[PDB]
Design a binder for this molecule. Structure first.
Ligand SMILES: OC[C@H]1CN[C@@H](O)[C@@H](O)[C@@H]1O
Ligand SMILES: [Br-]
Ligand SMILES: [Br-]
Ligand SMILES: [Br-]
Ligand SMILES: [Br-]
Ligand SMILES: [Br-]
Ligand SMILES: [Br-]
Ligand SMILES: [Br-]
Ligand SMILES: [Cl-]
Ligand SMILES: [Cl-]
Length: 836
């Protein structure tokens, strides 16, 4: 890289509750709450009813200190810069008697010149964190109304006054832990001549023949003299130079703007997951002053075009992604913070979450606007997994202030994070907020405030989301799409709006609509829809003692943040399943339910391309142990929904859909190549494994690239009696001309509660090696929605939550670093076992 030296300020930190003068070791990056936990000064916040027990923290102020040594040689470098990648939130930063900074925005990184303030020998850094509650109580007192941020779990809704992660105040799947601290790294850089403050690789054009780039650098030179320099940009792939360009300059004191064009002939394109390789070039910019490289900065760069097509059409207004010139059906989910305490999220946890997205056939993730702008690692992993990123700005579900001071704060954060993120191949679009305009129009605020205050909120909306944010995107990321809000117009109660742009269809769940409604209530793009489940028993055991395994234990209830939820789960369960008498069986069936219902929607959305061009379910993941809409619980365990999403998002899918006592079969493909001379084969099998009638064959089928087409239709009457529909299933298989199987599905003709499932034992043989367990499962009769349950937290399965078919063996590999060459406890559940 270059001649600079970096000192990480990540050890030797102490913290103190202000006014106590009592100090203890801290971990940085970190949080006040974690530091307290680490010294048993707080109980496990996620356990039982500990939520109320930890709230006192947000009322105190907190101080952090560290000491470090600087040598005479270090102090003689031309420049010395202290960088805070993140301070949560109101932080007075002192070094050696100087107030360097009064921080006030969790989402902004600060770079501070400190050479003239540093001393040879010991140097003392000291940070005072004002309570974000006590900082904002006087601001609320001045305001004369309470903003309607119902997810802020306090009588006074103070969240809206602070540029701090909205979810930290609470959410409808989240614990309240209003934390503070040095939440991202602190670095001291000792350098000569200059630093590169920003490097932007701006793609000017891209064809199969040529990529044209403009390398835009901002160089901050710290010395008083004029300094001859050569700027060099090297473009490489897998360690081999593809192109190199240079420019002679003379760097002036202060900011210098340097622009070097570069071209890449016959570029290797970045493709999204499912369509090819997510190829990334390495672009390195260096400043050379004579022999020495005084500054260097690199980015991984993907060469691709992303256009968001949002245009008036015959159906209303389209909303879809075109990637490298091809309409790409979006398949993915909404991402929330992985933890209540952000610095606790490790590299390994980020890697695993991406492995979970990639393995479920996803190509998109929405970074929802009540969390954070994610760390750099998150976007790097999106780049290398070919996952497009929809980035909200951090505003959600409430109007916000719009006074000049506040807007200037927000402007700083928008500029910072835009420049931080704009080089990522995965970055697809920006969205001003989550649900704010929908809130303003439909959530009844006009009965909560004076007409004057309401008008003020409406004008304040425009100032921020229709003016400041789009203008900032236009200036700093001019070829990326921005939309002011998600959903921008469509509302779930208003079918007339559903052909316009993206939908959050909360008809299912909030409107109590059955999952079958998802076949009829179609959006142009589904940016949210969802259904809750209790996480599995090992996760419940992590927050509850066995006496508090009920639905409505006090316990229990502390881990259900919606209000609404437990009763809705039982209501929906009764529609399709027998409600089990035991809590453990209810948990298992609720997982099955969430997975089955949701996959029915995912299937409808893809089936109804091109009217519908994407589906992002609510929600991928959890921030703590809780009952929620997630497909993956806090401990990384896949719920049934994650396996079902994987199946529903398979590049080629056979989709049987039965409505009005009739069956249709669609073939759905997101491949880039067309498949020709295909055969769909079907057969009706009873629960004892006996074929009813004969095989049905449909030959000569084509499955064009990026299409959903019906290839088969039949009435049930005259084919199967009501009795057969209760006692049999349909096997569907698709094969190429040579008879190689490319897809398979199973279809049931009745609701699970209406099936005549036989009593059955699932037997298994277990071959255990290191970190691995191979089970071979057998049942002579159908075992419905089987759940292979192990007590090992985070264990991975090759499959789970599937129907084990009569007399058809099935191999499942379980993996975990904790499986020893044995021995693994296995409990196999299936539907019939849940009642008598
Ligand atoms: O209520 C579930 C979710 C609905 N919409 C999302 O944008 C989130 O605010 C909620 O947690
Ligand atoms: Br300096
Ligand atoms: Br600086
Ligand atoms: Br300049
Ligand atoms: Br009011
Ligand atoms: Br706009
Ligand atoms: Br169906
Ligand atoms: Br039907
Ligand atoms: Cl505890
Ligand atoms: Cl980070």
């Amino acid at each position: 890289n270059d001649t600079s030296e970096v000192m990480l300020l990540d050890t030797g930190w102490e913290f103190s509750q202000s006014g106590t003068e009592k100090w203890m070791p801290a971990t940085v990056p970190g949080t006040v709450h974690q530091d307290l936990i680490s010294h048993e000064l707080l109980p496990n916040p996620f356990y039982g009813m500990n939520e109320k027990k930890i709230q006192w923290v947000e009322n105190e102020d907190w101080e952090y200190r560290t000491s470090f040594i600087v040598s005479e040689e270090q102090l003689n470098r031309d420049g010395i810069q202290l960088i805070f990648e993140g301070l949560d939130t109101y932080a007075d930063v002192y070094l050696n008697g100087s107030l360097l900074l009064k921080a006030d925005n969790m989402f902004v990184g600060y770079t501070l010149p400190v050479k003239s303030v540093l001393r040879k020998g010991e140097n003392h850094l000291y940070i005072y964190f004002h309570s974000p509650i006590r900082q904002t109580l006087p601001q609320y007192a001045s305001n004369g109304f309470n903003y309607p941020a119902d997810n802020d779990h306090h009588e006074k809704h103070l969240s809206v006054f602070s540029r701090k992660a909205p979810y930290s105040y609470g959410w409808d799947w989240g614990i309240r832990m209003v934390t503070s601290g040095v939440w991202r790294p602190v670095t001291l850089r000792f350098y000569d001549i200059a630093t590169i403050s920003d490097y932007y690789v701006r793609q000017l054009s891209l064809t199969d023949e040529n990529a044209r780039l403009s390398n835009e650098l901002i160089v901050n030179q710290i010395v008083p003299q004029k300094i001859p320099a050569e700027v060099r940009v090297n473009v490489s792939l897998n360690g081999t130079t593809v192109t190199e360009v240079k420019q002679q300059v003379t760097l002036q004191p202060g900011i210098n703007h340097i622009t070097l064009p570069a071209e890449v002939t016959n570029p290797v394109r970045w493709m999204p997951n499912g369509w090819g390789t997510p190829t990334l070039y390495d672009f390195s910019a260096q400043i050379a002053c004579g022999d020495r490289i005084v500054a260097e900065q690199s980015h991984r760069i993907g060469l691709r075009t992303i256009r968001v097509v949002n245009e008036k059409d015959k159906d209303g207004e389209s909303f879809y992604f075109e990637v490298n010139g091809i309409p790409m059906f979006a398949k993915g989910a909404n991402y929330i913070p992985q933890d209540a305490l952000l610095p606790n999220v490790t590299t390994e946890r980020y890697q695993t979450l991406f492995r979970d997205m990639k393995e479920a056939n996803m190509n998109m993730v929405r970074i929802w606007g009540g969390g954070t702008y994610e760390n750099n690692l998150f976007y790097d992993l999106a780049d290398e997994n070919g996952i497009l990123v929809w980035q909200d700005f951090m505003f959600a579900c409430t109007p916000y202030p719009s006074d000049p001071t506040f807007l200037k704060r927000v402007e700083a954060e928008a500029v910072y994070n835009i420049r931080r993120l704009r080089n990522h191949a995965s970055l697809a679009m920006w969205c001003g907020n989550n649900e704010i305009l929908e809130a303003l129009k439909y959530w009844g605020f006009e009965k909560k405030f004076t007409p004057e205050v309401y008008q003020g909120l409406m004008h304040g909306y425009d100032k921020l989301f229709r003016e400041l944010l789009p203008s900032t995107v236009k200036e700093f990321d001019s070829d990326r799409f921005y939309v002011h809000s998600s959903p921008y117009l469509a509302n779930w109660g208003r079918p007339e709006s559903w052909g316009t742009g993206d939908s959050h269809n909360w008809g299912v769940w909030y409107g109590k609509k059955p999952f079958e409604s998802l076949d009829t209530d179609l959006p142009r793009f589904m940016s949210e829809f969802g259904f809750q489940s209790f996480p599995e028993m090992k996760t419940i055991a992590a927050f509850a003692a066995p006496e508090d395994y009920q639905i409505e234990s006090e316990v229990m209830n502390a881990h259900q943040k919606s209000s609404i939820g437990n009763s809705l789960i039982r209501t929906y369960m009764e529609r399709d399943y027998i409600i089990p008498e035991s809590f453990e069986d209810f948990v298992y069936v609720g997982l099955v339910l969430q997975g089955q219902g949701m996959r029915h929607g995912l299937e409808a959305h893809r089936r109804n391309r091109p009217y519908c061009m994407g589906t992002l379910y609510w929600q991928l993941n959890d921030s703590w142990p809780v009952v929620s809409w997630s497909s993956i619980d806090y401990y990384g365990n896949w719920k049934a929904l994650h396996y079902q999403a994987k199946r529903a998002f398979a590049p080629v899918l056979i989709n049987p859909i039965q409505q009005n006592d009739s069956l249709s079969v669609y073939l759905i493909s997101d491949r880039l190549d067309t498949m020709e001379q295909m055969t769909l084969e079907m057969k009706v099998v009873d629960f004892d494994g006996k074929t009813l009638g004969k095989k049905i064959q449909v030959h000569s089928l084509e499955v064009p690239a990026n299409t959903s087409k019906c290839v088969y239709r039949a009435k049930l009457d005259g084919w199967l009696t009501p009795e057969d529909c209760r006692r049999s299933f349909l096997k569907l298989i698709l094969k190429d001309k040579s008879g190689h199987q490319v897809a398979e599905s199973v279809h049931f003709f009745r609701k699970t509660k209406d099936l005549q499932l036989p009593p059955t034992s699932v037997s298994y043989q277990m071959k255990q090696t290191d970190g691995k367990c191979e089970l071979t499962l057998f049942s002579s009769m159908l075992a419905k929605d089987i759940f292979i349950e192990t007590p090992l937290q985070g264990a991975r399965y090759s499959d789970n939550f599937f129907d084990l078919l009569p007399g058809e063996r099935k191999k499942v590999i379980i993996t975990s670093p904790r499986i020893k060459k044995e021995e693994l406890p296995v409990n196999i559940k299936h539907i019939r076992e849940t009642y008598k």
